[PDB]
Amino acid sequence: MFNNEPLEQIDKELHDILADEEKRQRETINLIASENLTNGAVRECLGNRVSNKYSEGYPKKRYYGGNDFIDKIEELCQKRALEAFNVSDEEWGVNVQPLSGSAANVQALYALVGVKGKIMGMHLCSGGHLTHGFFDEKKKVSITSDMFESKLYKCNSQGYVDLDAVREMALSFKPKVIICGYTSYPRDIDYQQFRQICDEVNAYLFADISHISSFVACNILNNPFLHADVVTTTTHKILRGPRSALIFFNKKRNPGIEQKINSAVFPSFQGGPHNNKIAAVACQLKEVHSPAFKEYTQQVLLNSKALAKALISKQIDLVTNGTDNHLIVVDLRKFSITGSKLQETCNAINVSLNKNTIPSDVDCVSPSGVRIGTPAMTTRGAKEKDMEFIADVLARAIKITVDLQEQYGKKLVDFKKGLPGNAQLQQLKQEVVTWAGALPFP
Amino acid sequence: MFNNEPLEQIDKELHDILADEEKRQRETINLIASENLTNGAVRECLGNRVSNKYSEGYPKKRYYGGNDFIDKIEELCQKRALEAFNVSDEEWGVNVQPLSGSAANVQALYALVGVKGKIMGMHLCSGGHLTHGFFDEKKKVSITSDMFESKLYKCNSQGYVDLDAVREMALSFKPKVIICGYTSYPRDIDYQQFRQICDEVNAYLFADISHISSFVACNILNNPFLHADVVTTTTHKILRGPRSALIFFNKKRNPGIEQKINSAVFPSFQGGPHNNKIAAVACQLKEVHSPAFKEYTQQVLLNSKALAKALISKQIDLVTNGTDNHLIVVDLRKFSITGSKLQETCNAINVSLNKNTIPSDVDCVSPSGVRIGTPAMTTRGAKEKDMEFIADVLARAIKITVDLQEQYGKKLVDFKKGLPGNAQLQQLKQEVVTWAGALPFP
Numbered sequence: 015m016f017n018n019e020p021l022e023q024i025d026k027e028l029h030d031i032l033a034d035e036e037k038r039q040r041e042t043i044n045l046i047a048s049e050n051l052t053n054g055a056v057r058e059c060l061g062n063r064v065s066n067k068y069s070e071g072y073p074k075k076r077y078y079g080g081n082d083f084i085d086k087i088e089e090l091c092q093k094r095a096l097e098a099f100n101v102s103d104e105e106w107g108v109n110v111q112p113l114s115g116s117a118a119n120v121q122a123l124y125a126l127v128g129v130k131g132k133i134m135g136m137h138l139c140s141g142g143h144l145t146h147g148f149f150d151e152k153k154k155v156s157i158t159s160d161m162f163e164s165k166l167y168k169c170n171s172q173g174y175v176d177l178d179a180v181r182e183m184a185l186s187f188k189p190k191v192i193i194c195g196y197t198s199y200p201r202d203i204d205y206q207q208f209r210q211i212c213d214e215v216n217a218y219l220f221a222d223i224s225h226i227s228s229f230v231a232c233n234i235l236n237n238p239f240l241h242a243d244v245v246t247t248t249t250h251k252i253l254r255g256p257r258s259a260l261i262f263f264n265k266k267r268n269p270g271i272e273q274k275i276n277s278a279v280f281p282s283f284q285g286g287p288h289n290n291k292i293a294a295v296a297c298q299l300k301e302v303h304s305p306a307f308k309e310y311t312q313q314v315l316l317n318s319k320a321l322a323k324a325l326i327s328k329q330i331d332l333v334t335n336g337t338d339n340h341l342i343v344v345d346l347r348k349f350s351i352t353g354s355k356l357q358e359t360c361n362a363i364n365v366s367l368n369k370n371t372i373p374s375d376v377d378c379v380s381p382s383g384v385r386i387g388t389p390a391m392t393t394r395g396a397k398e399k400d401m402e403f404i405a406d407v408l409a410r411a412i413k414i415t416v417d418l419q420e421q422y423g424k425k426l427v428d429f430k431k432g433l434p435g436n437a438q439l440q441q442l443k444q445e446v447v448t449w450a451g452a453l454p455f456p
Numbered sequence: 457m458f459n460n461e462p463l464e465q466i467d468k469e470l471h472d473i474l475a476d477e478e479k480r481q482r483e484t485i486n487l488i489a490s491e492n493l494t495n496g497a498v499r500e501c502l503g504n505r506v507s508n509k510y511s512e513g514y515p516k517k518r519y520y521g522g523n524d525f526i527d528k529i530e531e532l533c534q535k536r537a538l539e540a541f542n543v544s545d546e547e548w549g550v551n552v553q554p555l556s557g558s559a560a561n562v563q564a565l566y567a568l569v570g571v572k573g574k575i576m577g578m579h580l581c582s583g584g585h586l587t588h589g590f591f592d593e594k595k596k597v598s599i600t601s602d603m604f605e606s607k608l609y610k611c612n613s614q615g616y617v618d619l620d621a622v623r624e625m626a627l628s629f630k631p632k633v634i635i636c637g638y639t640s641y642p643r644d645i646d647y648q649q650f651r652q653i654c655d656e657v658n659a660y661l662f663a664d665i666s667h668i669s670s671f672v673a674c675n676i677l678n679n680p681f682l683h684a685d686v687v688t689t690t691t692h693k694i695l696r697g698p699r700s701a702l703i704f705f706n707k708k709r710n711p712g713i714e715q716k717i718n719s720a721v722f723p724s725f726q727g728g729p730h731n732n733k734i735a736a737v738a739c740q741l742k743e744v745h746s747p748a749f750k751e752y753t754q755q756v757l758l759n760s761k762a763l764a765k766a767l768i769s770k771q772i773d774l775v776t777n778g779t780d781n782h783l784i785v786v787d788l789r790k791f792s793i794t795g796s797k798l799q800e801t802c803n804a805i806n807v808s809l810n811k812n813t814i815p816s817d818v819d820c821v822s823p824s825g826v827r828i829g830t831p832a833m834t835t836r837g838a839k840e841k842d843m844e845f846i847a848d849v850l851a852r853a854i855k856i857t858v859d860l861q862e863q864y865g866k867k868l869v870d871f872k873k874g875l876p877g878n879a880q881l882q883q884l885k886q887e888v889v890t891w892a893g894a895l896p897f898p
């Protein structure tokens with residue numbers, strides 16, 4: 015008693031918007047540092063009937079019947095996760111049920127510290143995430159600043175994590191957890207030093223490696239599994255999986271954490287797992303372990319180095335004057351424009367990027383930069399030689415943005431009136447499309 | 457720089473488990489009240505490249521570029537949600553970004569009362585959800601009993617909601633929210649009478665209609681939208697959509713609730729929305745509004761009545777001795793067997809159900825019943841005349857379970873040794889598969 019007519023016939027309205035979204039993705043230079051494109055095998059999982067199953071609990075301990083094949087999928091995902099990040103099932107555990115990044119981080123924090131527990135994370139304005147305790151003087155913006163007591167550590171004026179400040183803060187504030195691993199931080203993390211500060215004050219070491227996960231798994235960047243008690247990560251960014259998250263916990267260093275983390279996920283916060291996600295994660299984690307994926311990940315940093323280098327050669331300032339990973343933050347103060355403005359200008363030419371704060375900015379309204387990153391375009395086949403072209407396009411967008419500000423003024427509402435019809439933007443878009451639309455599309 | 461080999465080639469191991477899940481689903485009598493089967497159109501959306509997009513925030517106010525077609529999908533889903541539940545976009549708003557039911561309920565309660573806030577909900581043992589403030593004397597099982605202060609109202613020994621107790625509890629406890637709508641409660645709700653109690657102590661009226669959503673939409677059961685301040689609902693049960701959730705808020709009765717709920721979802725708890733979900737929910741919400749889905753929903757209650765009636769005529773006791781909705785709770789005390797045992801017996805014959813508490817039980821270990829429901833089988837084309845057979849299979853399961861208890865004893869580990877190879881279980885399984893494997897499978 016159902017309708018099995020295809021999507022095209024059942025819902026032509028929705029199907030057209032998705033055919034459109036598909037074309038837009040195909041014809042865009044995607045520089046969002048947090049975005050990638052999944053292969054068809056991961057999209058077959060997400061489409062799979064396994065999402066019919068309620069399977070609350072953990073494998074073998076299900077509150078529903080008919081979970082025989084679900085428990086295998088869940089166990090196969092856990093194994094492949096522990097295998098992908100080069101850790102032993104003897105000392106490291108993994109929960110694979112968190113629905114996304116922010117859910118995973120709030121759950122893992124809760125497990126460790128409980129309500130009104132004390133936590134430390136990097137400031138949003140300095141590169142830290144919302145779920146790292148972010149608040150404003152005016153409001154508790156993240157739940158992690160309200161359901162927990164949080165304190166935030168700023169980076170230095172050059173854009174680097176100030177370990178002198180972290181230690182000054184940890185001794186006075188005395189938190190149960192210290193968060194590192196970040197949302198828009200272009201450099202590597204000394205986890206060892208974080209461990210020594212955590213050990214000084216008997217706080218837990220929390221490393222959220224969502225942005226840099228692939229690098230960690232492939233031993234291109236520092237390994238926080240050597241020092242951290244908990245490691246959180248999303249699966250949908252550089253790792254190139256579905257939208258999901260993973261909580262890793264260190265059993266050797268903290269026995270009985272397994273029960274605490276598992277109980278935090280369910281039944282503390284979530285109910286039924288999303289099994290199509292779990293299936294999809296499993297499929298991408300087998301890819302993560304291959305030598306082919308290492309090659310891709312290497313290409314990400316190769317492209318990122320080249321991109322930063324080509325932007326500096328065109329006199330554009332970068333936060334920390336470069337990058338160790340997949341991402342760059344462009345400081346736009348020398349041009350007297352904002353990232354809100356450059357994001358719209360880039361939206362008009364099919365260049366996807368996001369506004370981003372910098373160290374000198376006192377407000378998240380009027381951010382003075384944009385962040386870009388290479389995972390997506392590296393997935394589309396772009397090489398080091400291609401980065402000059404992307405640098406060329408970003409430079410012209412900045413120049414066009416200066417002109418449109420000159421003509422129409424600093425107000426953003428006024429600035430947008432400048433965008434539609436602009437001949438240079440039309441010629442530039444045309445250039446973006448012609449090149450982007452040609453690349454391999456998964 | 458990717459692998460576009462299909463799932464079968466890239467991951468034969470996983471592909472075989474999913475082909476196996478597919479066959480199990482096809483050859484099972486699914487009586488899990490919370491489960492359904494999604495059509496191929498809903499499954500195309502979940503597999504769609506729209507899940508590549510980071511679109512944090514709300515439509516027109518995105519922290520990322522390239523969100524033009526995503527904004528159309530998110531506004532189209534909101535439209536179709538308000539349309540489906542027969543509410544005016546002037547009076548009611550809807551957030552469509554919650555990732556699942558438990559996330560939606562925690563977020564909405566936060567919006568309303570905040571950390572340390574007071575809430576009231578039905579006890580788990582009486583039919584209420586974990587997210588309705590459930591705790592135990594030992595521990596705060598749900599975050600909703602820890603991040604909030606909760607008190608729990610039980611039903612009487614008859615299995616019915618006791619409004620005398622609710623009011624008595626509300627006057628003394630004075631919560632800011634009162635939750636109604638439930639997980640395994642077989643009768644309709646007097647929302648109007650809940651509204652009268654909420655107004656007396658100036659509390660919000662929270663209706664969670666996840667289990668009964670389709671009835672509310674198609675006007676077969678009471679309408680909480682006439683009285684409630686907030687309505688939550690999952691989209692993956694009787695509504696027959698993807699795994700997602702929806703928070704409805706009454707703007708007219710509570711000016712300023714819109715921002716407060718929209719900010720609880722993001723940036724308070726979640727980050728990037730899962731767009732494939734939103735696409736999928738939009739697709740099913742169009743189906744919900746047709747007269748054909750009303751037909752399906754009517755057939756759900758026709759089957760439920762017949763199923764209750766046919767179980768009573770085989771001398772099986774039901775809580776409240778019947779049902780007004782899609783679900784029944786079988787009380788198994790007279791047979792001296794637990795729900796755990798009957799769930800295992802039923803899994804050996806390809807009958808999916810779940811264990812469930814009843815009013816007389818003091819513990820959730822050793823629950824005295826099981827819960828069943830008709831949404832899934834009604835989707836597969838089963839009619840009233842088919843319910844006698846399901847009732848007969850369940851009767852035979854109960855009988856077999858008493859025998860297996862008699863032979864191997866009360867211990868559950870001992871009991872399962874009895875299951876493998878049993879001649880009448882093989883005979884019954886055979887009978888289950890033959891009928892189930894013949895029915896329409898979306």
Ligand SMILES: Cc1[nH]nc2c1[C@](c1cc(N3CCC(CC(=O)O)CC3)cc(C(F)(F)F)c1)(C(C)C)C(C#N)=C(N)O2
Pocket residue numbers: 138139141142143144155197198368369370371377378379380381512519723727
């Ligand atoms: C949207 C989001 N989530 N997590 C983030 C961000 C980022 C971000 C957040 C905000 N927020 C998002 C929530 C907002 C609170 C509200 O809405 O009431 C406070 C500022 C603002 C910006 C930018 F605009 F660039 F300054 C960027 C980026 C990645 C989009 C960010 C930065 N900078 C960092 N560090 O992390």
Ligand SMILES: Cc1[nH]nc2c1[C@](c1cc(N3CCC(CC(=O)O)CC3)cc(C(F)(F)F)c1)(C(C)C)C(C#N)=C(N)O2
Pocket residue numbers: 070077281285580581583584585586597639640795810811812813819820821822823
């Ligand atoms: C799994 C789950 N989620 N929400 C539910 C349930 C149900 C349920 C929950 C529990 N729980 C789940 C959390 C558990 C807490 C812990 O581990 O520390 C306490 C008992 C136990 C049962 C049953 F076994 F039948 F008694 C049923 C059902 C629908 C599966 C339930 C009941 N009865 C109700 N009312 O709601």
Ligand SMILES: Cc1ncc(COP(=O)(O)O)c(CNCC(=O)O)c1O
Pocket residue numbers: 047048114115116117119143145195196197198222223224225248257258510726727728
């Ligand atoms: C370090 C980090 N942690 C957690 C999250 C949360 O992920 P979900 O979006 O799945 O909740 C993000 C999101 N990153 C935002 C961005 O960098 O674009 C992040 O950067």
Ligand SMILES: Cc1ncc(COP(=O)(O)O)c(CNCC(=O)O)c1O
Pocket residue numbers: 068284285286489490556557558559561585587637638639640664665666667690700
């Ligand atoms: C009333 C109610 N509310 C919320 C949820 C949470 O849904 P998620 O599983 O999407 O978190 C459930 C699921 N209850 C499980 C069941 O009845 O089988 C529920 O019954």
Ligand SMILES: [Cl-]
Pocket residue numbers: 060288290291502730732733
């Ligand atoms: Cl999904």
